[PDB]
Design a protein around this ligand. Structure first.
Ligand SMILES: [Mg+2]
Ligand SMILES: [Mg+2]
Ligand SMILES: [Mg+2]
Ligand SMILES: [Mg+2]
Ligand SMILES: [Mg+2]
Ligand SMILES: [Mg+2]
Ligand SMILES: [Mg+2]
Ligand SMILES: [Mg+2]
Ligand SMILES: [Mg+2]
Ligand SMILES: [Mg+2]
Ligand SMILES: [Mg+2]
Ligand SMILES: [Mg+2]
Ligand SMILES: [Mg+2]
Ligand SMILES: [Mg+2]
Ligand SMILES: [Mg+2]
Ligand SMILES: [Mg+2]
Ligand SMILES: [Mg+2]
Ligand SMILES: [Mg+2]
Ligand SMILES: [Mg+2]
Ligand SMILES: [Mg+2]
Ligand SMILES: [Mg+2]
Ligand SMILES: [Mg+2]
Ligand SMILES: [Mg+2]
Ligand SMILES: [Mg+2]
Ligand SMILES: [Mg+2]
Ligand SMILES: [Mg+2]
Ligand SMILES: [Mg+2]
Lengths: 122, 121, 213, 50, 155, 81
RNA sequence: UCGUUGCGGGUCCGCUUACCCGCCGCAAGGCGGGGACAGCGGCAGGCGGGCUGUUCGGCUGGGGCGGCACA
RNA sequence: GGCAGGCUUAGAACCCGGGAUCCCCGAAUGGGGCUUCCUGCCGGGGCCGAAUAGGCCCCGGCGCCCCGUAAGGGGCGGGAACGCGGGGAAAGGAAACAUCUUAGUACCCGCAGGAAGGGAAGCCAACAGGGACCCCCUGAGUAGGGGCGACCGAAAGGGGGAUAGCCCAAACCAAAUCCUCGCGGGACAACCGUGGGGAGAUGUGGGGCUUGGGCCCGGGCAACCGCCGGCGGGCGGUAGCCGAAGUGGGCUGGAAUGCCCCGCCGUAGAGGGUGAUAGCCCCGUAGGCGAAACCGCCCGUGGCGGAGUCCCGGGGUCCCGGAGUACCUCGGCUUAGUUUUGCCGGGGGAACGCGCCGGCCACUGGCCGGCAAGGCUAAGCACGUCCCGAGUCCGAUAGCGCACUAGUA
């Protein structure tokens, strides 16, 4: 659970020469949302854990609350997850996919000759 | 192992900077017709104790034993191709191995014979 | 494409120190080498003012129909003894032009066998011309891989790729051997001047009727 | 200085060891090509920032 | 030879009724059901299938039927199947810091628009053209030079 | 631990007059380690060890043997004399 | 001014838990006071050389003041 | 290119593959560090010593934040350029200058990979049809933005490179599940049996993924979907090996490769060296052969598991189908986006498949196309520390600052 202060980000007034368009302060905000900011802060406290997602929880006068889902990619029960292997990496040898696909095509052609070839020729 | 590039700068770079095992191939000399028939190989790198015939230069026609070989310089010292310095000592002329013909072979080294079979075959 | 380093002569810390020092107002070194000039084309170590640019267009484009018309024109120049003698070739022993040989010549696989056919057809004197005409060229080309300048002797046109006659004649000094479908201006007019001593095979002449037109 | 730290003293030892011209046989070995060392300095002219 | 599907170029209002054909993405499901195969069987045989396409073209059907007969009569070798043959998924480090989570995607605009129309894409694309001095960026102010030149010469 | 012996004019005068052998050891060797090394290596008895680090960066140890052992005898026995 | 801002009672009164201020306690939590005000965020008006960027034309018996001989 | 003494035929030097050693500082990580050095606690060992005291020395462990029941595991720093997210100018241009441009650039902060990012229709279209994505050519300086000035500036479509589609959640079932360790077995694996521990009803697992699905019924296997990478073979890389033909006669010459004369090879006349200019003296070249070890790719075979999850036929009108989200308003940055781009912030704020979204201002009707707010994805594309090759490039004041004991003095 992450708590942070709402509002626009702390835009700094420039201390040097600027053209008048570039001197404003009030109303200027960051292109990042507080949800992504809350994700990054949670990522710092749990170093090495990957961020999955986060959602809004509550608002008050000063603060906004988010819940960030982080996962340990080094844990055995996380690596084999069908969803969590998208973040923790996944590899299949080409021999595994190529051999079975070849074997499927050999058997499909055998079946189609006896069942589809007479209809096609006719 | 000697550049295959046709650029002269790359050819000269590999020759000068060649390691010791590659400079041995620059010591190759032509065998005499008798030794060619006696061995069946057309070349052998010159070895200390081989008898050679100088074939170019001032000492062309001199035959002698190889007293010293230098891998770094790729030069060989032969008896007869000598001279005396100002102080009187006798010194050797460095002969490139490609200017001599091996008229006798030093085959006491067992490793040399195995190289003989490789080139006749 | 040739060029210089993009930052050559421009990466020194230099600046112009204005007037009043009694020295010219070109940029100079900022540090311990202060009076030393820098960055300008007229200074030692300065940038080249207008160097060669790698994006320069060196290729001279030619229309396809125009380029094929020239190839037919250069082909016709090989039919005349005047042009081939003008380009430099020796054709005194050549029985006639354009010189066409039978298609059995494509089976010659050895250089020694091919050398007979050149001698029997009066072509060997021009190949012999290129052999003794090889010269160590003057200038910096020796440093850059262009030590030798070798004349052109005879272009051999075979019917198709990978005939054995290509590997049997390609070692002769000045001799080019191409299939008729691979004809181009670099073999038909060396130096930009028409008229090349060409040995056509009979089958290549038959295949010429549907190319470059 | 009279009172030294050992780390500063050791770096002065390294500079003291290297401050020497090439030996005379090195000049003969290289045929007078190698005659000077870049680690040669004078205590009054060139100052170490040790 | 594997046959290639033939689809219609989308006839625009600007075209005025002139039409042409093109190589489509793949054979439609309707075209495959007239030869007895579904998407899985067709991809196993090696045909390119486009389940999104709804139209059916008889020229596409005939090319399928002629090729299918050669395959099933052992007169032709089918290509490898049109399915994924490798699974390479890399471990992701710093997804939150590189803006690859859902919040970062929303901030980049990928939820609401296409990648080509996102603003970060437009910044990168115009920078590559200026770096390489590409098509319109080889000259700055090319439109205004062209406009004034057209007035002066076509006056 | 020991690198070599010092056989200079000062070191030789010390050996004959104060029963001290001068050695060059590693820069990190302490007085406890130098006394243990000298006793173990040569089978003598050490009274005290005075150590200094030379301006060239080496450590020099003046090892005074106890009063039953000859500093010059150990130098001449080792063959470094 | 919009939100924070809630709970009772008849726009006004009250209440405390919000919030704020101090004291004690490592913290946990307690004590006192204020109090849905304040403070804080957004928006809006005012004062604003505190700070940022700029402009301060031309002719001319040299420039300037003048004049407009500037349409 | 010196002077000695050695090593090496018991096989050295050299090259390639695998190991050993690897001081101090360094992310530096016991704690400090105004000196790359110092110093503490615990445990073991050693030494001085009469001593088990006391002291001194060596060796090992001792960073922060985390995951895990624990055991144990992770992150930290670097790399020439490229990649992703955020913050973000000015000079100059406009012949002044403020909107504007420069420019989302320089630069800064953060985070990855050998590429990254993008990627699988709440799409584009126009009643005719396309059919994920990226990159190249074009559309095109067209539409449009703009002191409508300077200038800025797409997209669809067409031609190519390459080609590939899937999952999580939910409906329905309800612990059938997964991780760890001990033992027995099992190509050293997966997995099987058995037992302990941990997660799990706040739902593990099955099922499902637009050709929507769930649910009910019937038939068929060419079911389907996953896990391991053992055995055999082939190929390529990291050293190398073989490779034709004059050192013929004479001249000049210190010396020939030069000249005259005479021969020869050529799949090899690319190029270099050798006492001057060499196809045949030597290296090499055309062409061919090659690895104990390490690595990489491809093929055949081998070993397992799952809840039929696969295909075909019918029924359905019941259930599921992603929220501070869509949307409105205000401020701001940005965009060609213009009453119409995207986003951030303040405030307000839905519906549910009989619903919702889009079709260049809004609404109404029709028609057309679709199903947002969850995740992944090879190929084809950027770069140059580094390696290989090439050159109408330069040739020591040139060319990189450095042809040299140069990022040196
Ligand atoms: Mg400005
Ligand atoms: Mg220069
Ligand atoms: Mg030109
Ligand atoms: Mg000249
Ligand atoms: Mg001084
Ligand atoms: Mg432009
Ligand atoms: Mg002391
Ligand atoms: Mg208030
Ligand atoms: Mg206020
Ligand atoms: Mg001012
Ligand atoms: Mg004015
Ligand atoms: Mg004036
Ligand atoms: Mg006036
Ligand atoms: Mg430390
Ligand atoms: Mg500029
Ligand atoms: Mg201006
Ligand atoms: Mg100005
Ligand atoms: Mg990092
Ligand atoms: Mg990629
Ligand atoms: Mg990726
Ligand atoms: Mg722009
Ligand atoms: Mg479940
Ligand atoms: Mg050879
Ligand atoms: Mg040879
Ligand atoms: Mg949805
Ligand atoms: Mg010069
Ligand atoms: Mg220079």
């Amino acid at each position: 659970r992450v708590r942070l202060i709402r509002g626009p980000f702390n835009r700094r007034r420039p201390d040097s020469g600027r053209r008048p368009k570039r001197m404003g302060v009030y109303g200027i905000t960051a292109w990042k949302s507080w949800r992504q900011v809350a994700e990054e802060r949670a990522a710092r406290k749990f170093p090495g854990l990957e961020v999955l997602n986060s959602y809004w929880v509550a608002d008050d006068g000063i603060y906004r609350y988010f819940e960030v889902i982080l996962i340990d990619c080094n844990q055995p029960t996380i690596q084999r997850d069908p969803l969590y292997s998208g973040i923790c990496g996944r590899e299949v040898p080409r021999r595994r996919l190529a051999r079975r696909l070849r074997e499927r095509q050999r058997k499909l052609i055998e079946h189609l000759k006896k069942t589809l070839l007479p209809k096609l020729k006719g | 192992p000697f550049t295959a590039s046709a650029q002269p700068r790359k050819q000269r770079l590999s020759l000068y900077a060649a390691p010791l095992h590659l400079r041995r191939k620059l010591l190759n000399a032509k065998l005499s017709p008798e030794l060619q028939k006696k061995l069946g190989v057309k070349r052998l790198p010159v070895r200390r104790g081989d008898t050679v015939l100088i074939m170019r230069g001032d000492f062309k026609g001199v035959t002698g034993k190889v007293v010293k070989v230098d891998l770094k310089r790729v030069r060989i010292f032969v008896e007869g191709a000598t001279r005396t310095n100002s102080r009187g000592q006798t010194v050797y002329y460095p002969i490139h191995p490609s200017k001599v013909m091996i008229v006798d072979v030093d085959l006491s080294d067992k490793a040399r014979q195995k190289l003989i079979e490789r080139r006749k075959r | 494409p040739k060029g210089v380093y993009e930052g050559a002569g421009k990466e020194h810390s230099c600046e112009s120190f204005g007037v009043g020092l009694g020295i010219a107002r070109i940029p100079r070194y900022k540090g311990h080498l202060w009076p030393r000039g820098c960055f300008a084309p007229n200074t030692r170590g300065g940038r080249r003012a207008h160097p060669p640019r790698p994006e320069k267009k060196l290729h001279e484009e030619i229309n396809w129909k125009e380029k094929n018309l020239a190839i037919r024109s250069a082909i016709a120049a090989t039919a005349y003894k005047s042009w081939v003698a003008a380009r430099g070739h020796m054709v005194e022993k050549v029985p006639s032009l354009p010189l066409v040989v039978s298609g059995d010549a494509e089976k010659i696989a050895k250089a020694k066998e091919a050398k007979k056919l050149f001698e029997v057809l009066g072509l060997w004197p021009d190949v012999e011309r290129a052999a003794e005409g090889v010269k160590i060229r003057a200038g910096k080309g020796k440093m850059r891989g262009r030590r030798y300048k070798e004349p052109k002797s005879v272009l051999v046109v075979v019917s198709e790729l990978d005939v054995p006659l290509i590997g049997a004649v390609r070692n002769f000094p000045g001799v080019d051997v191409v299939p008729v479908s691979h004809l181009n201006m670099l073999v038909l007019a060396p130096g930009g001047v028409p008229g090349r001593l060409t040995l056509w095979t009979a089958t290549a002449v038959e295949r010429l009727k549907g190319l470059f037109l | 200085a009279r009172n030294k730290p050992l780390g500063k003293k050791l770096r002065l030892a390294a500079a003291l060891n290297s401050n020497r011209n090439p030996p005379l046989w090195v000049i003969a070995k290289t045929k007078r090509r190698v005659t000077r060392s870049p680690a040669r300095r004078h205590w009054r002219r060139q100052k170490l920032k040790a | 030879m594997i046959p290639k599907p033939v689809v219609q170029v989308p006839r625009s209002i600007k075209s005025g009724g002139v039409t042409k054909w093109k190589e489509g993405r793949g054979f439609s499901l309707g075209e495959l059901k007239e030869v007895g195969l579904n998407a899985e069987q067709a991809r196993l045989l090696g045909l390119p299938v486009d389940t999104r396409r709804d139209s059916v073209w008889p020229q596409n059907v005939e090319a399928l039927r002629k090729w299918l007969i050669e395959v099933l009569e052992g007169k032709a070798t089918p290509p490898e199947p049109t399915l994924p043959k490798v699974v390479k998924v890399k471990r992701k480090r710093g997804r939150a810091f590189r803006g690859l989570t859902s919040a970062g995607r929303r901030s980049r605009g990928l939820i609401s628009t296409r990648f080509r129309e996102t603003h970060n894409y437009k910044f990168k694309k115009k920078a590559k053209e200026r770096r390489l001095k590409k098509r319109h960026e080889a000259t700055k102010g090319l439109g205004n030079v062209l406009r004034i030149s057209r007035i002066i010469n076509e006056s | 631990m020991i690198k070599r012996f010092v056989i200079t004019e000062k070191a030789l005068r010390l050996a004959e007059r104060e029963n001290k052998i001068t050695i060059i050891v590693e820069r990190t060797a302490t007085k406890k380690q130098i006394a243990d090394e000298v006793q173990r290596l040569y089978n003598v008895k050490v009274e005290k060890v005075n150590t200094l680090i030379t301006p060239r960066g080496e450590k020099k140890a003046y090892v005074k043997l106890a009063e039953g052992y000859s500093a010059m005898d150990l130098l001449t026995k080792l063959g470094v004399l």
